[PDB]
Design a protein around this ligand. Structure first.
Ligand SMILES: *[C@@H]1O[C@H](CO)[C@@H](O[C@@H]2O[C@H](CO)[C@@H](O[C@@H]3O[C@H](CO)[C@@H](O)[C@H](O)[C@@H]3O)[C@H](O)[C@H]2NC(C)=O)[C@H](O)[C@H]1NC(C)=O
Ligand SMILES: *[C@@H]1O[C@H](CO)[C@@H](O[C@@H]2O[C@H](CO)[C@@H](O[C@@H]3O[C@H](CO)[C@@H](O)[C@H](O)[C@@H]3O)[C@H](O)[C@H]2NC(C)=O)[C@H](O)[C@H]1NC(C)=O
Ligand SMILES: *[C@@H]1O[C@H](CO)[C@@H](O[C@@H]2O[C@H](CO)[C@@H](O[C@@H]3O[C@H](CO)[C@@H](O)[C@H](O)[C@@H]3O)[C@H](O)[C@H]2NC(C)=O)[C@H](O)[C@H]1NC(C)=O
Ligand SMILES: *[C@@H]1O[C@H](CO)[C@@H](O[C@@H]2O[C@H](CO)[C@@H](O[C@@H]3O[C@H](CO)[C@@H](O)[C@H](O)[C@@H]3O)[C@H](O)[C@H]2NC(C)=O)[C@H](O)[C@H]1NC(C)=O
Ligand SMILES: *[C@@H]1O[C@H](CO)[C@@H](O)[C@H](O)[C@H]1NC(C)=O
Ligand SMILES: *[C@@H]1O[C@H](CO)[C@@H](O)[C@H](O)[C@H]1NC(C)=O
Ligand SMILES: *[C@@H]1O[C@H](CO)[C@@H](O)[C@H](O)[C@H]1NC(C)=O
Ligand SMILES: *[C@@H]1O[C@H](CO)[C@@H](O)[C@H](O)[C@H]1NC(C)=O
Ligand SMILES: *[C@@H]1O[C@H](CO)[C@@H](O)[C@H](O)[C@H]1NC(C)=O
Ligand SMILES: *[C@@H]1O[C@H](CO)[C@@H](O)[C@H](O)[C@H]1NC(C)=O
Ligand SMILES: *[C@@H]1O[C@H](CO)[C@@H](O)[C@H](O)[C@H]1NC(C)=O
Ligand SMILES: *[C@@H]1O[C@H](CO)[C@@H](O)[C@H](O)[C@H]1NC(C)=O
Ligand SMILES: [Ca+2]
Ligand SMILES: [Ca+2]
Ligand SMILES: [Ca+2]
Ligand SMILES: [Ca+2]
Ligand SMILES: [Ca+2]
Ligand SMILES: [Ca+2]
Ligand SMILES: [Ca+2]
Ligand SMILES: [Ca+2]
Lengths: 411, 411, 411, 411
């Protein structure tokens, strides 16, 4: 009878928490990436097309993160709407008006369907199986502060340790066994900076270590869990046209490197050729947020089709690209035509607790940027597409943004 | 005590799943169609009237499917809104912007009330009593791919086997005993093509068979469950003004034919006369998505009132129309005046697990198309009406779209 | 142990149904009306003011009905929005576009917050403690059909028995002990017609009786439960400036009469004077939907302040007004200034299962009509206010609509 | 077995109530304020920027109150939208159109996301752990009535006892042990008035006491719970540039005073100098709603940066400011630049039942007012920011409103 009273009370508390969407069992995060052959399209929001008339936020960085019940598109907005004068982009990215918000995947980002997450001009978010963790960085450049919320309640803060634009992933953090992990950068974007990895439990930073990474540069990391460890594929904005990466276990014991493949993943970049396991200096300054998925010595690379502009997008399976420097690959899947605009891209995963699979499902999102600087508008925004890897038949195509620019507000 | 612990745990898991709207018992699908005498109006969304000022999607194919808790209108949109320049219809139906989405029955389809389902220029959706199954076909004409989601998670893919526009129902699939069934077509729309029927469990294709149907043509099938089997009434776009049909059991053992009644159900069509159990060649090319309900040798036929254009709509009970070729019928119920536009129509059912009845309730939806090609606008959209069969008093009338064209965007 | 298994299963089913908002215990409806002294304001939606820019339905008859969890404003819309050309009122009230929908009390009626209920140009709705009952009448004047839904599922139909505009309450029906009751009228509005009262259980009409009421006229009845019986105060559109009423028990055994007070409750009406327990012919043709609450021989009367137009609104407690013909009363509470527009008004109740009280709480809603015919617009709409009776301090004031006419669409 | 049946029934009732968001255990309110070092930003809605095109209410007083599940922004609106002619502010604050409504924290206040709370031109709201208590004052100046709702149901009324504008907090009331407490004022705003404190249980006023406070003036009190008592920091609109305060226990046994610090907290105010524990007459007439948090003899003061206009905002920790009159302080945290508009501000708390902490978390909100009287518009509205105190690293900055005035409606 005591056993029954215990089970009843515990299950009742689980039911009461579940009424609010709060889980009861942490995501294990110990399964490996699923074997896949290609990418099946998951979502397209048509945000800018709809925003030509609907009330849609002007957004950037529409990254996706999933709980055990839903997948959401998180994004940063300047608190302005498309086709409104406040969309005039003479506000620089880091502003007091910028906020991290979220809406259901596939829906246009509107004030009528978007939940508020935090005040942020740089952000990260993930779900540990119980509640949502959100990290939002706001403040001055010389003393930015990341506010860390768990289930909407402020649980911690992280202040800049270099006083030079504290900034983080702009995609989902990675959660394993009830601890979530993220990467933050403080310092120059055109030179050596400082990079730290953080272990956070129930929204409280329980550990951090600074990477000893001379001549490396980490920004806007795409991190995913795999077999109980974390892999982050990032952006070298200093002097690398191949992508830097850092992996670590749950105790923040890490390894670092660069993707060796001659199929260079950053943008801008040189033409394909001999790759390097060190920073590739040629056209290596600047970059774009990106991702890659590691399968042994092979790598799935998501990259633009252009070597010079954020145009086009493609998935490339290079079965030796993680460790070897040749420019040969096996499979290419077209995602966006080179004649059309792309932009930031990131990874996200679907855990077994959501899918029912015995493996970690990889997925990715792509931001389709319209407006300034390449188009004659007063604004810059992005719509989103997203794909998940499957071990079944797929096809390549082009799913571009589709909006007709300039808008009414631009004339 | 062990029995109590088992019941508690299982019912608690049912409660936790039900919190997300996820059922626990599959729909049986073994009851027969309810005896009815007429059709009681169920819904009207006034989509285009509202969209004259509100933010409403330009849509097509507003088909309805029901779970055990709700009925939803699924639809395909080009990601544009009424009275916006992106509604300009020089995008052909099969575009990378087209998406399958859903809203509550009776509501205007808006970005503020519509859930995203999939990227699709051809679609199907149903509910097995536990979760929603969605099928969305996107991609190039020579290699289209259907993404199959169960509870929002990609569970399978189906690639074109003829490289000639893989395409499916544009209405609800049919679920019996935990297996859902659909029909897909690959090949020409003006000649012999290939037709396959699929059995899908938890979003995974567990069986498929290709119909041996020489001189038949199947497109845009309206399928419903009845007594543990499936009946599909479809569209012969090749050379049939009567409608083709295919029925099958849960092992995909099938029968095929054409509705024999001289009350021809397709559009365009000849005037009523002697029917055929074979394809009726006269005015048989082209067509419109439609449905019919079989009661023994009799048939409830939903059809346009015009023989040449998608104008008007009417329900006709022909007590021998499934097998006999005479043009006589018993009952006609007016739905839309011939002076007003109609369009696609489809069937949907309400299962005993939703209604509390001991039989399968038949219902149908009708799409009221406005805009191009017959009206001087830049856009084409559709509103919806829906009726359910009852064994009580009914009446005929005309419930047309009601919008005043052209809109502001057209001048 | 068998007792525990039974309790667990039954409570689990109650929990699963409650997840959808479906109750488990019927409203008793056997308590008497609460003793009150005045009316405390409950809601104001400012619908037309907000609709000057927001996307708000052009509506009529915004009646309120409450479940055990919420109170909703039901209304009829022509499927058009304020400040849109489709709001042009050359559509007569009875149209195929008119629909019964509902939104939360106090909110402006928008396509983004309104649930679809039924297709209807005349309507009624109530809640029996388990599910919502909706009655929506649509169709031609000579054969209108009321579709009766329970929990959103069509459960019955009622066809016109006189072929002369079947029409019903335009306010909430009354539910007692699991049976809900309504009144419908078929026949002329300027002469003797037919009046029927209906007893409906789980959406199925289980009984109906036709009133033997020579020289009486019933339209647009406001019905409420009291002590296990039903009282309806209605509108004599034929030849009565006092209001007709009909009361009945759960077996539809009824009594009829007219409110005897010289404080005449209809509009138009003569000046106050000697009342009648028979139809008051003077200025008795035409009318307005209204209500009254009976307390022994006294009556709470809600009426316009003008004797000729739908202007102003006031509550009047006449402690002998139900049976005596004098024009004297005790208390008057101002609701809307006579310089401002009013319109339809109706009663609604809050049951003990919702309030926690030991009595039936009376409340009422008032429709504030703007537009045609008295104002120079192309449209006619109404906003709503609502009050509930309390036995505590209250005050009179004027809470008018507040919109500035004409709107942009009118020029 | 009887114990099991009791536990099952009680937990089932808790589950059924929790399905509607209704709690089962009252907030204790006996913990002390958390030790903090600074303020981490919690929210920013960008209301006016978004309302330049979106459908956003013109609002005032956007105060925040939290339950055990969510935090909401309550606000008063005139039932008009930004950039609509009805936003013309020749309606004085106290109007029959004004309503108290609420939306999720951080979201722009829209008719599509705002719940209706009450009709009110003065308001208060809080949550006792079970249900929401709302107090809305409407009516004429000489007989205003506060309607008191608990869980949306009218539970009490409070009529003006001085017939001179009954008015209350415009921020959250304070709840301890199932009793909630508020302060109301009746009488002049430029002279001695009457001030009452109210104890309310389940929406019923169970006690009230009138303060014997000669030469004091209380308006727009910000009240918070601390260690089982209530502290209110208010506004002296008569003759005080320092803020008045009143504290009391659950039996309404009270103490009164003024904040002694020479860091004057009201606006307008003199320059910092020698403070007073009595009303500071210099520049003491008029004022602004504000707050302060008491920590022993020290005080956290939120105030404007300007001494003359509602411009700028800053948090100041004065470790002896509650009792000592010196103008020295320890810490200042910038919130809004003095070059930018601020306005009303208030406190709100997050209880242990929401946070999981062992202490009472203090937070505050700030209203950023745009429009009349200082800007050349026809309207006046406010957006909101909010911060919570943390014992971790923070930073000062300026998070202003950000809208570009005048709007389209103003030309
Ligand atoms: C988008 O924002 C930019 C930056 O605010 C706008 O350009 C700015 O336009 C303003 C007003 O036209 C210019 O101000 C002018 O400055 C001079 C100072 O001597 C004075 O003569 C004028 O009275 C006026 O205030 C401002 O200089 C200009 N900024 C820059 C960097 O050129 C731009 O117009 C906006 N675009 C839109 C709304 O489409
Ligand atoms: C709806 O879409 C159609 C198709 O895009 C629009 O018609 C197209 O209009 C464009 C721009 O007016 C035409 O482009 C023109 O082409 C010639 C090429 O020699 C050049 O002289 C001009 O500079 C211009 O770019 C385009 O030809 C035309 N397409 C067709 C098939 O006629 C149509 O205007 C749209 N309707 C709207 C927005 O109401
Ligand atoms: C609101 O609706 C009414 C009724 O539809 C509108 O009045 C109608 O306006 C139309 C078009 O202006 C008139 O049609 C005209 O009829 C004659 C037939 O001989 C023909 O000469 C013209 O070509 C034209 O089609 C119609 O007669 C008229 N109806 C009535 C009863 O007068 C009214 O304009 C609408 N108001 C708005 C949109 O503000
Ligand atoms: C915002 O509201 C104010 C107050 O209602 C508006 O000012 C008012 O404008 C009206 C109409 O223009 C004026 O009425 C005029 O009054 C005289 C009476 O002799 C008459 O000659 C005219 O026929 C007219 O009706 C009214 O006096 C004026 N009120 C005040 C206090 O000056 C104001 O225009 C509104 N602003 C907007 C809509 O931008
Ligand atoms: C119910 O509670 C017991 C004891 O805490 C736990 O082991 C079990 O997993 C819970 N069951 C569910 C379905 O949550
Ligand atoms: C992952 O952890 C879970 C914890 O429940 C365990 O059941 C499972 O076997 C583990 N899988 C591995 C180690 O592959
Ligand atoms: C509870 O669980 C038992 C055992 O699995 C099952 O037979 C029963 O139907 C469940 N009851 C409900 C109401 O779901
Ligand atoms: C349909 O299947 C259900 C399964 O629970 C069964 O109870 C019912 O009798 C069946 N009805 C038939 C075969 O008509
Ligand atoms: C649980 O079920 C029992 C048996 O059916 C019933 O008497 C009881 O009222 C139910 N309890 C609740 C809280 O619904
Ligand atoms: C009303 O009916 C309920 C049914 O539960 C009963 O408990 C109550 O005493 C009745 N009240 C009366 C007759 O006043
Ligand atoms: C369940 O009910 C018991 C008895 O009323 C109560 O003590 C206990 O706290 C409840 N448990 C929960 C989790 O609400
Ligand atoms: C506050 O009251 C709660 C009531 O459950 C009690 O457990 C706790 O110890 C109290 N805390 C104090 C007095 O600090
Ligand atoms: Ca680079
Ligand atoms: Ca290679
Ligand atoms: Ca055909
Ligand atoms: Ca026949
Ligand atoms: Ca009359
Ligand atoms: Ca009297
Ligand atoms: Ca002052
Ligand atoms: Ca000091």
């Amino acid at each position: 009878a005591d056993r029954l009273e215990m089970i009843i009370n515990d299950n009742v508390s689980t039911i009461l928490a579940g009424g609010s969407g709060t889980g009861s069992v942490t995501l294990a995060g110990n399964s490996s990436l699923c074997p896949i052959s290609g990418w099946a399209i998951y979502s397209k929001d048509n945000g800018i097309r709809i925003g030509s008339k609907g009330d849609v936020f002007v957004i950037r960085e529409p990254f996706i993160s999933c709980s055990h019940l839903e997948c959401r598109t998180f994004f940063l907005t300047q608190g302005a709407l498309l086709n409104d004068k406040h969309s005039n982009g003479t506000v620089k990215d880091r502003s007091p008006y910028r906020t991290l918000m979220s809406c259901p995947v596939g829906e246009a980002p509107s004030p009528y369907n978007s939940r508020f997450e935090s005040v942020a001009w740089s952000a990260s978010a993930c779900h540990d199986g119980i509640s949502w963790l959100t990290i939002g960085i706001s403040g001055p450049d010389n003393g930015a502060v990341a506010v860390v919320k768990y289930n909407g309640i402020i649980t911690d803060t992280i202040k800049s340790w270099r006083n030079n634009i504290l900034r983080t992933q702009e995609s989902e953090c990675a959660c394993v066994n009830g601890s979530c992990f993220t990467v933050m950068t403080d310092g120059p974007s055109n030179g050596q900076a400082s990079y730290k990895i953080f272990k956070i439990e129930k929204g409280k930073v329980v550990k951090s270590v600074e990477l000893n990474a001379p001549n490396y540069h980490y920004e806007e990391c795409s991190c995913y869990p795999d077999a109980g460890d974390i892999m982050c594929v990032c952006r070298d904005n200093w002097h690398g046209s191949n992508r830097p990466w850092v992996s670590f276990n749950q105790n923040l014991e890490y390894q670092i490197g660069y993707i060796c493949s001659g199929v260079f993943g950053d943008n801008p970049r040189p033409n394909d050729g001999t790759g390097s396991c060190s920073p590739m200096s040629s056209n290596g300054a600047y970059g774009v947020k990106g991702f890659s998925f590691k399968y042994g010595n092979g790598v799935w690379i998501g990259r633009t089709k252009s070597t010079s502009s954020r145009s086009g997008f493609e998935m490339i399976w290079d079965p030796n690209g993680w460790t070897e420097t040749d420019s040969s690959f096996s499979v290419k899947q077209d995602i966006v035509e080179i004649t059309d605009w792309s932009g930031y891209s990131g990874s996200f995963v679907q855990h077994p607790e959501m899918t029912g699979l015995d493996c970690m499902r990889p997925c990715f999102w792509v931001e389709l940027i319209r407006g300034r600087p390449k188009e004659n508008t007063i604004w810059t925004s992005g719509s989103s597409i997203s794909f998940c890897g499957v071990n079944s038949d797929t096809v390549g195509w082009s799913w571009p943004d589709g909006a007709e620019l300039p808008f009414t507000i631009d004339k």
